[PDB]
Paper text:
Inhibition of butyrylcholinesterase (BChE) and p38α mitogen-activated protein kinase (p38α MAPK) offers an innovative dual approach to mitigate two major drivers of neurodegeneration in AD: cholinergic deficit and neuroinflammation. Using structure-based drug design and a library of known p38α MAPK inhibitors, we developed first-in-class, selective dual BChE/p38α MAPK inhibitors with balanced activity against both targets. The X-ray crystal structures of the two most promising molecules bound to both enzymes were solved. Structure-based design of MTDLs that simultaneously inhibit p38α MAPK and hBChE led to the identification and subsequent optimization of the first dual inhibitors of these two AD-related target enzymes.
Compounds 94 and 95 showed balanced submicromolar inhibitory potency against hBChE and p38α MAPK, while they did not inhibit AChE at a concentration of 100 μM, which was also one of the main objectives to diminish potential side effects. Compounds 94 and 95 showed high selectivity for p38α MAPK. The KINOMEscan assay showed that off-target inhibition was limited only to structurally related kinases (p38β MAPK, JNK1/2/3, and CDK3) and was absent at 1 μM, where only p38α MAPK was inhibited among the 103 kinases tested. The bulky isobutyl and cyclohexylmethyl groups occupy HR II, delineated by Val30, Ile108, Gly110, Ala111, and Asp112. The 2,4-difluorobenzene sits in HR I defined by Ala51, Lys53, Leu75, Ile84, Leu104, Thr106, and Leu167. The optimal distance of 7.9 Å between the hydrogen bond donor on the indazole core (i.e., the N 2 nitrogen of the indazole) and the 2,4-difluorobenzyl group allows exquisite selectivity toward the structurally and phylogenetically most related kinases. The amide group is critical for effective inhibition of p38α MAPK as it acts as a hydrogen bond donor interacting with Asp168 of the DFG pocket (3.2 Å for compound 94 and 3.6 Å for compound 95). The tertiary amine (i.e., the dimethylamine group) faces the solvent, which explains the retention of p38α MAPK inhibition when this functional group was not present. A statistically significant difference was noted in the latency to NW zone entry between the LPS-treated control group and mice treated with LPS and 95 (p < 0.05). Considering this, it can be concluded that the test compound 95 positively affected spatial memory retention measured in the MWM task.
Author numbering: 5 to 170, 185 to 353
Amino acid sequence: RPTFYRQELNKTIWEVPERYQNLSPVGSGAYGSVCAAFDTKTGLRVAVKKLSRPFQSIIHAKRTYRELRLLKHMKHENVIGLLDVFTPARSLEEFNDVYLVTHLMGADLNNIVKCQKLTDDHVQFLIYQILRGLKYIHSADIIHRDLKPSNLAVNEDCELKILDFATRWYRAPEIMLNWMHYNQTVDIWSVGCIMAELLTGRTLFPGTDHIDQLKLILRLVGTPGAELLKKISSESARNYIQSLTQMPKMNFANVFIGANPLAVDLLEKMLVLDSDKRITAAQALAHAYFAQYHDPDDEPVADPYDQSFESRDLLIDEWKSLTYDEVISFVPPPL
Ligand SMILES: CN(C)CCNC(=O)c1cc2c(cnn2CC2CCCCC2)cc1Cc1ccc(F)cc1F
Ligand SMILES: Fc1ccc(-c2n[nH]cc2-c2ccncc2)cc1
């Protein structure tokens, strides 16, 4: 066991190993509290997240276990991974706090898309890396569910990482309709919304609520056709759609004028209303828009990921002991 030092940062208190120095608050909210730090063992600038009340309730305890299992499994250049996980407690009885460590990135995509306007080549490379990370995530039967600029970080090399899994302007419309069985291409919808925003500098669907959001989407891609209507079980959904002033699929080349025709074509394949017809991450990496970057032998998939715990009804102490197990079995990655 290493040796710890303590401090108060904002109103959070922090107990971390000596190796992590110069902790500076980066922001805080539901997830927990995040500090930037300098790792003296490796020389890396790292990001340290202290979970908020990880074992306060069954939902918190399960969510804590979920996040740690996920982060420990992701080993991919475009997906955040675990550099380290530690607790100050020396026993399971005292175990009450969890800190997670990952590489610190330079800026989030929210601060690139406002502070400058992005060239087509940057858009190619950035979307390529998202899709490459998404191919790996999806190959593990994992859905991100919350892809958006603020959950994407880039360094000065323009290298990109997807972070923090799970009216929202980037959410697939089958969720605005509350369909219970949405699939992994909800993430592709979000990528479509993001790439559109990098090309125009404007939010694509800046809706004010679930209803306004769906209306902005249908104005671009048009009302659902009969093949898609046949798949909607919800009678209220079905009725609301059949009794809207019907609208045609706009031509995307008109909407996204001046954009590379290949970027427009890919956008048409991502922002399809019917989720069964949406392009997948693996197929999108092979789209000609990414010819400059696509390499089928350097777009790996993930080892299988056991998500059986998701269906379990356990006590707080059981979720907590399972989390402790995962802290101790952690093997840092080869430096
Ligand atoms: C909307 N999100 C923000 C929710 C909260 N996520 C983070 O604050 C976060 C951001 C991260 C990183 C890494 N690089 N950057 C990009 C930032 C860095 C500060 C300013 C420039 C851009 C990590 C984490 C969170 C985090 C995850 C896992 C982990 F093991 C430790 C963690 F710390
Ligand atoms: F208006 C819309 C918008 C999206 C959809 C949709 N796309 N993919 C799947 C669905 C869907 C929606 C509701 N119920 C089942 C399936 C259906 C109607």
